[PDB]
Design an enzyme around this catalytic site. Structure first.
Site, PDB file in Angstrom:
ATOM      1  N   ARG A   1      18.574  25.087  57.415  1.00 18.41           N
ATOM      2  CA  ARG A   1      17.988  25.794  56.257  1.00 18.41           C
ATOM      3  C   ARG A   1      18.688  27.146  55.923  1.00 18.41           C
ATOM      4  O   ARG A   1      18.748  27.510  54.760  1.00 18.41           O
ATOM      5  CB  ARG A   1      16.461  26.006  56.451  1.00 18.41           C
ATOM      6  N   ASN A   2      19.231  27.874  56.923  1.00 21.82           N
ATOM      7  CA  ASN A   2      19.907  29.157  56.652  1.00 21.82           C
ATOM      8  C   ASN A   2      21.441  29.022  56.421  1.00 21.82           C
ATOM      9  O   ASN A   2      22.215  29.900  56.820  1.00 21.82           O
ATOM     10  CB  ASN A   2      19.601  30.203  57.735  1.00 21.82           C
TER      11      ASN A   2
ATOM     12  N   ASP B   1      20.443  34.110  54.779  1.00 22.91           N
ATOM     13  CA  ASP B   1      19.114  34.449  55.283  1.00 22.91           C
ATOM     14  C   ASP B   1      19.169  35.077  56.703  1.00 22.91           C
ATOM     15  O   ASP B   1      18.562  34.558  57.640  1.00 22.91           O
ATOM     16  CB  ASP B   1      18.246  33.160  55.188  1.00 22.91           C
TER      17      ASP B   1
ATOM     18  N   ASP C   1      18.494  33.579  63.778  1.00 23.15           N
ATOM     19  CA  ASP C   1      17.872  32.511  63.006  1.00 23.15           C
ATOM     20  C   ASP C   1      18.920  31.515  62.510  1.00 23.15           C
ATOM     21  O   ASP C   1      19.030  31.281  61.305  1.00 23.15           O
ATOM     22  CB  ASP C   1      17.001  33.056  61.853  1.00 23.15           C
TER      23      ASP C   1
HETATM   24  C1  LIG Z   1      16.926  25.631  52.592  1.00 27.83           C
HETATM   25  C2  LIG Z   1      16.735  26.961  51.827  1.00 27.83           C
HETATM   26  C3  LIG Z   1      15.826  26.805  50.635  1.00 27.83           C
HETATM   27  O1  LIG Z   1      14.667  26.443  50.771  1.00 27.83           O
HETATM   28  N1  LIG Z   1      16.365  27.063  49.424  1.00 27.83           N
HETATM   29  C4  LIG Z   1      16.291  26.464  48.087  1.00 27.83           C
HETATM   30  C5  LIG Z   1      17.778  26.975  47.962  1.00 27.83           C
HETATM   31  O2  LIG Z   1      18.086  27.542  46.660  1.00 27.83           O
HETATM   32  C6  LIG Z   1      19.085  28.479  46.569  1.00 27.83           C
HETATM   33  C7  LIG Z   1      19.032  29.699  47.168  1.00 27.83           C
HETATM   34  C8  LIG Z   1      20.106  30.602  47.064  1.00 27.83           C
HETATM   35  C9  LIG Z   1      20.242  31.802  47.825  1.00 27.83           C
HETATM   36  C10 LIG Z   1      19.173  32.228  48.765  1.00 27.83           C
HETATM   37  C11 LIG Z   1      18.305  31.406  49.506  1.00 27.83           C
HETATM   38  N2  LIG Z   1      17.349  32.103  50.112  1.00 27.83           N
HETATM   39  N3  LIG Z   1      17.616  33.396  49.784  1.00 27.83           N
HETATM   40  C12 LIG Z   1      18.721  33.520  49.011  1.00 27.83           C
HETATM   41  C13 LIG Z   1      19.295  34.848  48.732  1.00 27.83           C
HETATM   42  C14 LIG Z   1      19.493  35.274  47.424  1.00 27.83           C
HETATM   43  C15 LIG Z   1      19.767  36.603  47.156  1.00 27.83           C
HETATM   44  C16 LIG Z   1      19.858  37.523  48.189  1.00 27.83           C
HETATM   45  C17 LIG Z   1      19.701  37.091  49.500  1.00 27.83           C
HETATM   46  O3  LIG Z   1      19.755  37.916  50.599  1.00 27.83           O
HETATM   47  C18 LIG Z   1      19.352  39.277  50.437  1.00 27.83           C
HETATM   48  C19 LIG Z   1      19.441  35.757  49.778  1.00 27.83           C
HETATM   49  N4  LIG Z   1      21.344  32.538  47.789  1.00 27.83           N
HETATM   50  C20 LIG Z   1      22.326  32.103  46.985  1.00 27.83           C
HETATM   51  N5  LIG Z   1      22.350  31.029  46.215  1.00 27.83           N
HETATM   52  C21 LIG Z   1      21.222  30.253  46.270  1.00 27.83           C
HETATM   53  C22 LIG Z   1      21.240  28.998  45.620  1.00 27.83           C
HETATM   54  C23 LIG Z   1      20.211  28.115  45.796  1.00 27.83           C
HETATM   55  O4  LIG Z   1      20.200  26.822  45.351  1.00 27.83           O
HETATM   56  C24 LIG Z   1      21.046  26.487  44.246  1.00 27.83           C
HETATM   57  C25 LIG Z   1      17.325  28.078  48.982  1.00 27.83           C
END
Ligand SMILES: *CCC(=O)N1CC(Oc2cc3c(-c4c[nH]nc4-c4cccc(OC)c4)ncnc3cc2OC)C1
Length: 310
Positions: free
Chosen positions: A143-144, A157, A139
Site C-alpha cells: 500500500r505505501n 506515505d 511502514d
Molecule cells: C494504496 C494507497 C491508496 O489507498 N491510494 C489510492 C491511491 O491514489 C493515489 C494517491 C497518490 C498519492 C498519495 C497517496 N497517499 N498519499 C499521497 C500523497 C499525496 C500528496 C502528498 C503526500 O505526502 C505528504 C502523499 N501521491 C501521489 N500520487 C497519487 C496518485 C494516486 O492514484 C492515482 C493512494
C-alpha cells in the site's frame, strides 16, 4: 554537536497556480486530488497529487519528505512543495496507477516474472537510499508504494520516518496503531526499530506481491503474533515461489537482526534473477502475460555495476 545541517529546500506555491481535476482519495485525515501544476512564465503542465488540526499541526509529514529529497533517488516519492491557504495543500508528483497493493489485485492475471522481480529491486534501491540518509521508514508495505508507470514504482506515505544521529543506530517507540503483521519481533517486544526491522517488513512486502495482494496472517487477531513468531512459525511459502525467491523472505525474518540481509544485498540477489526471471518465478502463462539477450558462459552470479553498492 557533531551532526550534519539539514539543508533541504521547501517550496511555497499558489492555489490559483493549480487546476485540480478529480478526487483520488477522501481519507480519515484529509483528501488527495488529481491536480495539474501550471507555473507562472514557463510553458509547462505537471501532473500532481494534492493533500488537504486538533492538537498539533501537520508539517512533520513534510519535514522528512524533503530532507531525503536533497540527493535524488528515483524510487522514493518526492514532495514538490506546499500551498498555505486556510486549509493547507501538500503537493507531490502524480503516480497514475495508484498503490501497488491495488495493482497486484486488479492486474493480478497479467503480471510477468520480470515485472515482479524488478519491483523488488526498485523497492530495495529506494530502501537502500533511505538507510544511507540514516532514516527508518517504519511502514514498508505494498500500500505505501505507487505506480509512476508499470515499470517505474516509488516508495510513498513515510508517516513514521525517523532520522538517526551520527552515533545512533536504534529507536524507542510509544506504541500507537502500527500494523503488527508487518512488524519485526523487536518492534513488538521491546519496541526497537532499526534498518534491519524494515527488512522484516520488506520480507512481508515481497511475500504480499508473490501471493498477489493476499492477507498476511489472514483470519488472525493481532494479539498472538507476539508469541506465534517466538515459537518459530512464520508466513508460509507462496505458490509461484521457487526455493531461491522464497528463502530470501525467510532469511529476512531471522530473529537475530544481524542474520537478516542488508538492502544493498537484496538489490544484488534480485538483480541477478531479473536477467533470467523464468528460472526463479513459476507463473502459469508467464511469457503470455503483459502490462503497459546474453553474452557469456558462466553468466550466473553476474551483476551490473550500477546495482553494486558496498
Ligand atoms: C494504496 C494507497 C491508496 O489507498 N491510494 C489510492 C491511491 O491514489 C493515489 C494517491 C497518490 C498519492 C498519495 C497517496 N497517499 N498519499 C499521497 C500523497 C499525496 C500528496 C502528498 C503526500 O505526502 C505528504 C502523499 N501521491 C501521489 N500520487 C497519487 C496518485 C494516486 O492514484 C492515482 C493512494
Amino acid at each position: 554537536s557533531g551532526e550534519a545541517p539539514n539543508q533541504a529546500l521547501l517550496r511555497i506555491l499558489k492555489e490559483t497556480e493549480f487546476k485540480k481535476i478529480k478526487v483520488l482519495g477522501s481519507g480519515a485525515f484529509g483528501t488527495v486530488y488529481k491536480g495539474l501544476w501550471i507555473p507562472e512564465g514557463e510553458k509547462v503542465k505537471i501532473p500532481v497529487a494534492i493533500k488537504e488540526k486538533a492538537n498539533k499541526e501537520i508539517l512533520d509529514e513534510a519535514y522528512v519528505m524533503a530532507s531525503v529529497d536533497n540527493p535524488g533517488n528515483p524510487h522514493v516519492c518526492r514532495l514538490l512543495g506546499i500551498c498555505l491557504t486556510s486549509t493547507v495543500q501538500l503537493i507531490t508528483q502524480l503516480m497514475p496507477f495508484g498503490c501497488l497493493l491495488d495493482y497486484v489485485r486488479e492486474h493480478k492475471d497479467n503480471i510477468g516474472s520480470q515485472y515482479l522481480l524488478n519491483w523488488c529491486v526498485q523497492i530495495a534501491k529506494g530502501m537502500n537510499y533511505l538507510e544511507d540518509r540514516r532514516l527508518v521508514h517504519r511502514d514498508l508495505a505494498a500500500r505505501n508504494v505507487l505506480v509512476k508507470t508499470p515499470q517505474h514504482v516509488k516508495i510513498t506515505d513515510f508517516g513514521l520516518a525517523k532520522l538517526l544521529g551520527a552515533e545512533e543506530k536504534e529507536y524507542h517507540a510509544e506504541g500507537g496503531k502500527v500494523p503488527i503483521k508487518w512488524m519485526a519481533l523487536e518492534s513488538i517486544l521491546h519496541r526497537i526499530y532499526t534498518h534491519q526491522s524494515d527488512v522484516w517488513s520488506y520480507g512481508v512486502t515481497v511475500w504480499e506481491l508473490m501471493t498477489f495482494g493476499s492477507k498476511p496472517y489472514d483470519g488472525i487477531p493481532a494479539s498472538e503474533i507476539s508469541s506465534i513468531l517466538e515459537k518459530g512459525e512464520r508466513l508460509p511459502q507462496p505458490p509461484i515461489c521457487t526455493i531461491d525467491v522464497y528463502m530470501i523472505m525467510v532469511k529476512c525474518w531471522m530473529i537475530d537482526a544481524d542474520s537478516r540481509p542488508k538492502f544493498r544485498e537484496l538489490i544484488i540477489e534480485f538483480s541477478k534473477m531479473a536477467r533470467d526471471p523464468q528460472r526463479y518465478l513459476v507463473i502459469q502463462g508467464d511469457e503470455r502475460m503483459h502490462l503497459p539477450l546474453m553474452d557469456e558462459e558462466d553468466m550466473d552470479d553476474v551483476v551490473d555495476a550500477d546495482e553494486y553498492l558496498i
